[PDB]
Design a protein around this ligand. Structure first.
Ligand SMILES: O=C(O)c1cccc(O)c1
Length: 318
């Protein structure tokens, strides 16, 4: 018998716990004949703040984490390419792209971990208390939360005043008037009542969504290496590209009930097209250009990484 401590920041009802890590742990339990037991600690129940999850798993404080890569700026620089404006297709396609990217050109970002999967949410949407966002200009003066440095820079480039914070802080920042809105996909919102606190929602039409942000599902390397050959095989049968594909499929599906909750609560949903959409995409090109230069400055071939990311997304877009 092996006990593995899983740690993450969302509360127990959040999809990442209840509909991803919990069934993963049940499949791992079943396929190891009750021998590999994951103990799930949501809501930072083993201590620390969300950016520390990667340190905890790296150092063996815990054995497995689910987190947002960009909650620790600069630590996973290759993955930033997938956060650039208008990169994501479905979570299913974009998650497989992320995993193959990490398996190949971006492996150095995660060399200190056992990678279970890297994947992402369905494209994020724009949420405000009441003001409909029809164009970039409607964001002028609005304090808008994003999850990572790349996404806050996108918000600045669309005219907003960016504020960064992990998602559990958003509701309080809204109710206290510290932010006027945020970007998140639908799926995370009900776990924090965010569809009650924002009634105006904007998405984009077409085949590339506003943004996504990579999730990391990681195991401590030494702990993985200590497992028996048979236990490694159970873990690996529940890791890699197949898991990233399943995760992306799940995250696409998670949008559906969450969107319905938001509209049932009195929300509006507006979908940018035409001129307003083109204006946002043109603004995004500026961030893409500056990101490529910033990757160059950090020793990466920024142009090659952006091309690779785009090509992998389209490869898996079926
Ligand atoms: O925007 C985020 O920080 C976030 C965190 C967890 C799940 C998710 O869909 C989004």
């Amino acid at each position: 018998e092996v006990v593995l401590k899983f740690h993450s920041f969302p509360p127990m009802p959040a999809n990442s716990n209840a509909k991803f890590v919990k069934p993963w742990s049940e499949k791992v339990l079943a396929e190891s004949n009750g021998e590999i037991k994951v103990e799930i600690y949501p809501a930072m129940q083993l201590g620390g703040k969300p950016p520390q999850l990667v340190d905890q798993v790296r150092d063996g404080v815990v054995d497995i984490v689910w987190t947002v890569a960009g909650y620790t700026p600069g630590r996973f620089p290759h993955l930033e390419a997938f956060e650039l404006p208008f990169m994501p297709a479905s979570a299913e396609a974009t998650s497989q792209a992320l995993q193959e990217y990490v398996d190949t050109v971006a492996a150095s970002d995660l060399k200190d971990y056992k990678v279970l999967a890297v994947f992402c949410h369905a494209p994020g949407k724009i949420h405000t208390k009441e003001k409909v966002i029809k164009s970039a200009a409607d964001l002028n003066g609005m304090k808008m939360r994003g999850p990572t440095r790349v996404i806050t820079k996108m918000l600045e480039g669309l005219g907003a005043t960016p504020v960064g914070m992990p998602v559990p802080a958003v509701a309080g920042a809204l109710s206290k008037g510290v932010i006027d809105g945020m970007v998140v996909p639908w799926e995370i919102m009900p776990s924090f009542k965010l569809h009650e606190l924002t009634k105006a929602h904007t998405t984009v039409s077409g085949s590339r969504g506003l943004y996504t942000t990579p999730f990391l599902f990681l195991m401590n390397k030494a702990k993985y290496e200590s497992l028996s050959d048979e236990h490694k095989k159970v873990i690996d049968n529940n890791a890699g590209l197949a898991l990233a594909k399943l995760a992306g499929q799940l995250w696409d599906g998670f949008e559906v009930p969450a969107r319905k909750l938001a509209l049932d609560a009195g929300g509006t949903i507006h979908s940018l097209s035409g001129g307003p959409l083109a204006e946002m995409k043109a603004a995004g090109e500026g961030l893409e250009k500056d990101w490529i230069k910033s990757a160059n400055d950090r020793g990466l071939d920024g142009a090659m990484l952006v091309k690779t990311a785009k090509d992998l997304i389209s490869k898996y877009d079926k």
